[PDB]
Design a protein around this ligand. Structure first.
Ligand SMILES: CC(=O)N[C@H]1[C@@H](OP(=O)(O)OP(=O)(O)OC[C@H]2O[C@@H](n3ccc(=O)[nH]c3=O)[C@H](O)[C@@H]2O)O[C@H](C(=O)O)[C@@H](O)[C@@H]1NC(C)=O
Ligand SMILES: CC(=O)N[C@H]1[C@@H](OP(=O)(O)OP(=O)(O)OC[C@H]2O[C@@H](n3ccc(=O)[nH]c3=O)[C@H](O)[C@@H]2O)O[C@H](C(=O)O)[C@@H](O)[C@@H]1NC(C)=O
Ligand SMILES: CC(=O)N[C@H]1[C@@H](OP(=O)(O)OP(=O)(O)OC[C@H]2O[C@@H](n3ccc(=O)[nH]c3=O)[C@H](O)[C@@H]2O)O[C@H](CO)[C@@H](O)[C@@H]1O
Ligand SMILES: O=c1ccn([C@@H]2O[C@H](COP(=O)(O)OP(=O)(O)O)[C@@H](O)[C@H]2O)c(=O)[nH]1
Lengths: 361, 361
């Protein structure tokens, strides 16, 4: 009767995915849900605020593992998570996205013959030097079920020999999350007030990819470009903590004072800020999809994206950070554009289709 | 001129590394560093190979072993990453498909260090095996893939890995057998010491987890060997996990009904394999080695990765379901030979491999 579904989460974006799938498994007939928090994101504004605001039950476990190397974080999460799998003996392990926590969770489980489902599977940058590309490839190939959010993602899995019958195109659970919590965002978040921002009276930015923040010249191009954009249209920038650290370390911390820079915000503020932005500048996977949700034009500050449908649809645009002034003009040019009318990422019921496919198989 | 670091951990890894390291020591300017994970630590599992096979002492002994998948893999991951940051090698070489192989590849790849997999692309199609996971994830984590067979090339192509990263080089274990054959013949008295002549016994090894971790499959095997022994002597160098399982299950007494040894060194092993009437094994290398010597083999498994041995009739699977049948199969196959065919290359897989590591850029 009770299938036990154990969820491994470690990062902000995973807490948000999980909140959509938890909601649905909670009120599932005879499903017990166990939640493990790897500890990867520990700070109040990267972790706790999402459990509080998205009504996610307290983790059954917090492994408290974070802030080391790839080897340390992964290695220990592997040992710790196995310890919990041995105690809890679940029927399914679900992993999310593509961090070291995703891979450690999966790898812990497959070695115990515990089935593994990958929520958000089959995405590819085709840059194998990226640690996130390796995590998603190794995760997909270790899983038993692959919950694809797009047709591209499905073709990507088929191309690497993974069979039809283990792939389910379910759309994106982060679209579910945006539907379920938008109202709560309306009636709780006053961030437009607190910042004194008029709706569609600003540009919203996030930047945290390692290929953008570890490289001084890239990080400088971006912060220069955003400060120019701000002269013309205010830039709001909840600054990822690693990004903050890197810009302080290379002596770029002044460009952050020259825009409206914030510590990281919870999901409800973020929804509000995203919704009411004239345009969104990001290097985030989640934020670029979210821009499309609200039909706000987007610029992706990378050489590629895994979300190729947003480019085809013209809601999203690549601007690699080679030149501060070029990137500024690209941003400012794109804010009076829009994309075509199209429905991606499903019906807002990816989580429920996932719940269903898990009680059958 | 270029630094190549090897991660070995267990007996079959030392035998493969031996062949390759012999070629690399000849190569102009190539420094080798050798990391022994600690996975095998008994002297007749580790030390003996280093001595008889002329392998320089490991540059590092991490001393990890005896734990779960989680524990070993995790601790190895962190530890190898430690060495790799110290040694900053240009290449990491990983062999076969133990937990050490995988910790090796994962440590290396998150550090942007090229990984070459010796013995790449083999597939059991059984994901319950820890070792199937191991080679799948290793192959997907590698930049070079030294495949030993045309099957393994095909296996890799079907999982989306490009032709340009796959090289069919043959098997370094044939290079091994070839180079150490005269030495084993000259130095091994294993026959004298046991009181055996040629062709007047049967050699057996068993250590798969799937065979040893399950009481009833192990009983089947031990009883079937005990029966065969009544008809033709059975010589059984017993893996320590296999002995420790036999003791914990009460099945110790079966090992008196055969010629049970402690594990032997490569030199004694060659002589045993060479002069056997039939080999019965759940081992990877031993299957191939039985064909090296034109000795019929029986593989006490549900599948093998070495499928060409079945097609050429050198080998024959016999899953352990029934003591009486397993014994019968074993005795029947004594009367068979395979077809004359060359497999596994010309004995210079190690040179091809060295050649590729140097001229890769
Ligand atoms: C490039 C890359 O690999 N990315 C992977 C990465 O996600 P990601 O890039 O989106 O990181 P991230 O931007 O922190 O999260 C966004 C969320 O935070 C919210 N968000 C953002 C900022 C903020 O201040 N407050 C806030 O609530 C936003 O509203 C939004 O909902 O980790 C994910 C994970 O493992 O699950 C993978 O699915 C991704 N893989 C892909 C392919 O997109
Ligand atoms: C089933 C499986 O995955 N197997 C993998 C496994 O090796 P394996 O199954 O062959 O274990 P194993 O039999 O201990 O050693 C054989 C050698 O020991 C010598 N040997 C054996 C017994 C003895 O007493 N003395 C001795 O010298 C023999 O002469 C012989 O040369 O780990 C390997 C590794 O990671 O490198 C993978 O390459 C293998 N994958 C394959 C695909 O064969
Ligand atoms: C999951 C994994 O990596 N499996 C590999 C491992 O099997 P193997 O059976 O050796 O797996 P482990 O390395 O986990 O060792 C199993 C157990 O054997 C005992 N032990 C081990 C080594 C030793 O010197 N003394 C001793 O007593 C310990 O109790 C240990 O836990 O190496 C074999 C080589 O022979 C390979 O065929 C297997 O693919
Ligand atoms: O709660 C948190 C999470 C992360 N970080 C910082 O942000 C970095 C992000 O690294 P993490 O391992 O979390 O993410 P990855 O880059 O591996 O996806 C960490 O190293 C820390 O410097 C932080 O300050 N607080």
């Amino acid at each position: 009767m009770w299938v036990k579904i154990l969820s491994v989460v470690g990062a902000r974006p995973q807490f948000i995915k999980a909140a959509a799938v938890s909601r649905v498994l909670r009120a599932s007939p005879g499903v017990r849900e166990v939640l493990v928090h790897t500890g990867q994101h520990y700070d109040d504004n990267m972790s706790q605020v999402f459990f509080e605001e998205l009504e996610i039950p307290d983790p059954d476990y917090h492994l408290g593992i974070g802030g080391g190397t790839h080897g340390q974080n992964t290695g220990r999460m592997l040992e710790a998570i196995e310890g919990v799998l041995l105690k809890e003996k679940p029927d399914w392990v679900l992993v999310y996205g593509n961090t070291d926590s995703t891979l450690a969770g999966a790898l812990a489980a497959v070695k115990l013959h515990i089935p593994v489902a990958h929520v958000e599977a089959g995405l590819r940058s085709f840059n194998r030097r990226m640690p996130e590309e390796i995590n998603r490839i190794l995760t997909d190939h270790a899983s038993d079920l692959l919950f694809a959010p797009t047709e591209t993602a499905v073709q990507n899995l088929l191309r690497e020999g993974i069979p039809e019958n283990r792939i389910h195109l379910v759309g994106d659970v982060m679209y579910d999350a945006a539907l379920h919590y938008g109202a709560k965002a309306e009636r709780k978040s006053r961030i437009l007030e607190r910042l004194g921002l008029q709706a569609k009276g600003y540009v919203l930015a996030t930047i945290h990819r390692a290929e953008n923040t570890d490289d001084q010249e890239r990080l400088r191009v971006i912060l220069e470009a955003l400060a120019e954009v701000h002269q013309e249209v205010p830039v709001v920038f909840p600054v990822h903590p690693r990004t903050r650290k890197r810009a302080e370390a290379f002596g770029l911390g002044s460009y952050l004072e020259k825009v409206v820079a914030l510590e990281p915000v919870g999901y409800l503020d973020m929804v509000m800020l995203e919704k009411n932005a004239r345009l969104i500048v990001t290097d985030s996977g989640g934020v670029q999809k979210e821009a499309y949700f609200y039909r706000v034009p987007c610029v992706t500050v990378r050489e590629e994206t895994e979300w190729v449908e947003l480019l085809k649809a013209e809601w999203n645009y690549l601007a690699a950070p080679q030149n501060a002034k070029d990137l500024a003009l690209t941003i400012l040019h794109r804010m009076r554009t829009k994309g075509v009318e199209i429905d991606l990422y499903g019906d807002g019921r990816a989580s429920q289709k996932i719940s269903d496919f898990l009680r059958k198989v």
